[PDB]
Amino acid sequence: LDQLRQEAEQLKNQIRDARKACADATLSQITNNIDPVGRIQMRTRRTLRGHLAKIYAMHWGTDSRLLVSASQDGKLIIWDSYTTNKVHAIPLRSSWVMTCAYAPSGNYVACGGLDNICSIYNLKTREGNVRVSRELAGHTGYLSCCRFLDDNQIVTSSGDTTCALWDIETGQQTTTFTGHTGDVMSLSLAPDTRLFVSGACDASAKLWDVREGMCRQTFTGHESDINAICFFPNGNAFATGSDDATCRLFDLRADQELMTYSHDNIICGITSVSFSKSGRLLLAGYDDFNCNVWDALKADRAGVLAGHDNRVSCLGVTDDGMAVATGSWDSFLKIWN
Amino acid sequence: LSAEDKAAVERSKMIDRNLREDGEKAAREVKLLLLGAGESGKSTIVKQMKIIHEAGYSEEECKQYKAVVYSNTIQSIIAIIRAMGRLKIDFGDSARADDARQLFVLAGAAEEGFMTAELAGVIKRLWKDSGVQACFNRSREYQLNDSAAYYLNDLDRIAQPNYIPTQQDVLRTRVKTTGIVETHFTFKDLHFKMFDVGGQRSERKKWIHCFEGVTAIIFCVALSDYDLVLAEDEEMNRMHESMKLFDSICNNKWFTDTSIILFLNKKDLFEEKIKKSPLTICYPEYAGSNTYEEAAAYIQCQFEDLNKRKDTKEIYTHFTCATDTKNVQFVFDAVTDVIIKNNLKDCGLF
Amino acid sequence: MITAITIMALYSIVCVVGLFGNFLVMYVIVRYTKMKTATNIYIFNLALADALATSTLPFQSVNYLMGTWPFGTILCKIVISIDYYNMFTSIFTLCTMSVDRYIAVCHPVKALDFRTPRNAKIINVCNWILSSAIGLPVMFMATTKYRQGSIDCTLTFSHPTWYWENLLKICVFIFAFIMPVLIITVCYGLMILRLKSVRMLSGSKEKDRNLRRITRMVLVVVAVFIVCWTPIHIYVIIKALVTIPETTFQTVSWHFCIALGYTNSCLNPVLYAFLDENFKRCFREF
Amino acid sequence: SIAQARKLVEQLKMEANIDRIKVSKAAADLMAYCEAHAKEDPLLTPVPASENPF
């Protein structure tokens, strides 16, 4: 009963000093010979207007042209980033939406929120407009993230402390990813789609296995709710943004902290992180009406993306690395280059 | 520039037109959020508002609500029988003890809402006992549903799960849906949007900013919970935890100026419980008399003194029974005041 | 001598401060705040009416300076048309702003489903159209008349000269002074009574002080309208009623009343725009 | 309770026996990936107006 905890503590100590014994250097000590990015300035090329309520999430497209955005007005607007157009506007059965997704093939769009149901939508119906294809029920908490593995599967985060892996056609949870001790906030999917990390309220990020279905690693270090998560482009690292006014880069191989991205005169939280194509830029959408541009190798601010009249809540970089999208609570999306 | 993609521009224009129409239709309404403690009467309040305004209920909806009724009767009789094992109240005779034994046996194997007539007879013979009525009277020493008398006084003689229950049965029973519950009704050219957080036992902080922009917060406080206690540590009060929950809601950063429609529910139980049990069980420093008016005003003034911004944020404390026609009129008056304030916020007036 | 320079000085100062106030309102309402609300569109169109109505003040002042109109018949036609049109527009937009505030207060749900920005747009368009419906006969009817070589321009009428004079005077009295002030007084009186009856404006010191602030600014609006429009209309009516001998004090008083009306149109934007809490909120951030 | 603690202990045992390469080689690999794709990154090296679709 109580004999298990006193040796779980020494197992934790074994993990901690095994990570400490494998930390002969840091990321910053061997990146000093790299010339810095400098002070890069990005301009708002497109100002996607048309929402009315606070946008909470957006997801890009694999073709790097279309994107989707979810807002409290109850609409899933599918934009056209090049021409500032709107190709679809899906009405939601429940207006309380906290996340949205987009298919790697571009055929489907997911959403979910306080109704605890992940609604999949089919954009290529020949019978007419976009209608609900499948409603994935089975979560007892609010859906907070959802990523399509492909047209067949989805990996969803929820506030019931458990993640999920739904087969869409059967509409059932094939695999459940439990192990956290807090409400799970956001999950990022690996480029090879075989693993995925997820942050939660317990200030920990867990790297799971998509096929096998177990937790492989647990990363600590934050002091508050981890709101955002994003894989590094090679799949061997990831960056988490938390409410403790800092971002941290972890490592799937060294299995410990790599670098913190903190700055003085910053107290607001981070709700979105996203990497560039080369991974040199870590874009973090803060809560002080801005979206700071960080360097993932020198841990210095190379820029800032101001122009939003409320809290930036969601980011995104296209698959070809061309642009940066930035939603906010001021009912506006923006594109940067 | 007169290209092939002009169809895309026309589609975007019609999408913008329809979306603007939907947005103005949404902005021509009023949105309210329900908050309160456990079993305070919020769902019954909005069910009454929906019944008197929108419509009744469907056949299949009444079917799952009768399933909820059967689950509620089973849970209530299980609690009221197992309360004797801790409160030490003996049965009238050995026949009722055998009836309780077979009730435990039947509750150990549950399939659906079949409601065998033997089980109904067991319920009837158990409820027709002096000890069970005594523990029903002494039920303030533990937890019990406030509609258990309604189930065990009228729904005992149902005899078959073959026909839909009455609207009163649906009104007093709520589902265990963990998701958010949204009800719509129209009262004098306003479209009300009640947002009951049914279940949602998840940190109360990652979606409390989703409601920054609601018109008002209909808080609910059970008046009959001043003498009841919680069977988890036996060191806290239900009224006191309702008070601190109201204090945490009122001091929230997202509801700095959001008006509160404070409903003090279950006055029909408070007025009949304050005759026997004094209010001094809840507040040990209460000095007034044990009358309904003074005690109710005392609870109201404590809940209003929880507010720290009384000069700008208004609280509408109304004593309600959750089965009243004036219940929606109180809400209408409060939201009309808030709409007047919002229409005064622009034009440089307020 | 002294009278000429005093009249020139007063017209010049009221024109420059009216143009300065209206253009400050213009720059603020196109750069700091936007016209996404109904009251901002009303303030913008009132600023247009007041700016274009006082833009013809230097022409009248130089007309009094030389006693002649060397500009021509076409320029005096457009000056007369602009003056009448952009004064009627200002009066009617004051009327519809008062109606808007009364609808916002006393009829809350009607203010929800009626006060869309597009509805304010169509109200302003109908306002300018209804002002043009009376400003265009004035365009067709005004002309340059020859009087002892001073070519002073005055509105000449049809063969029943006195009947058209009386018709124009009664139409500018009862449809631009009597009905506007009656509408303003009844709308603001009902608004003040409803704001007295409402719960969150009474029962405390701060709420009573707030209600005092709204009542004070409303009474300031009505008082300045009365004190700056009564001398003009009463003076015009009694001039049309009894003959007045020509003297220095008569012309000085006539031009002073004219200056009072133009001072009303001058201080209207500093009284509506710069007293708004929306403007204070958007300006204190700078 | 007991089963939950046993499951947590088994999970920590599964988390402790995995292999962990050095931080130096992983940081060098991240540096190599960054310098091997910095040529193709548009945000790092923005084309003025030629290949901008925006």
Ligand SMILES: CN(C)C(=O)C(CCN1CCC(O)(c2ccc(Cl)cc2)CC1)(c1ccccc1)c1ccccc1
């Ligand atoms: C009609 N009445 C009694 C007015 O008071 C008047 C306009 C009177 N208008 C002024 C210009 C004028 O002097 C003139 C002569 C020749 C030229 Cl070339 C150019 C201008 C001719 C007379 C007004 C409003 C405000 C301040 C002062 C006067 C007004 C009232 C209501 C609606 C429209 C106009």
Ligand SMILES: CC(C)CCC[C@@H](C)[C@H]1CC[C@H]2[C@@H]3CC=C4C[C@@H](O)CC[C@]4(C)[C@H]3CC[C@]12C
């Ligand atoms: C010389 C002048 C006085 C002649 C008459 C000018 C007319 C045509 C002008 C003056 C005021 C103008 C309006 C002022 C304000 C707005 C709001 C803006 O969002 C759209 C145009 C709109 C609705 C304008 C339409 C045209 C308008 C009515």
Ligand SMILES: CC(C)CCC[C@@H](C)[C@H]1CC[C@H]2[C@@H]3CC=C4C[C@@H](O)CC[C@]4(C)[C@H]3CC[C@]12C
């Ligand atoms: C007197 C107070 C209370 C109110 C004043 C406002 C009105 C009634 C005033 C303003 C200007 C005034 C006029 C100014 C000058 C003259 C010329 C004089 O030879 C006779 C009186 C007469 C024609 C005045 C009549 C009254 C008048 C029209």
Ligand SMILES: Nc1nc2c(ncn2[C@@H]2O[C@H](COP(=O)(O)OP(O)(O)=S)[C@@H](O)[C@H]2O)c(=O)[nH]1
């Ligand atoms: N006799 C009587 N019963 C009342 C009254 N008010 C409320 N109740 C009952 O109290 C229980 C909890 O209600 P509810 O489901 O909303 O709880 P909750 O949403 O907080 S979880 C419901 O069964 C209500 O019939 C009243 O005046 N008289």
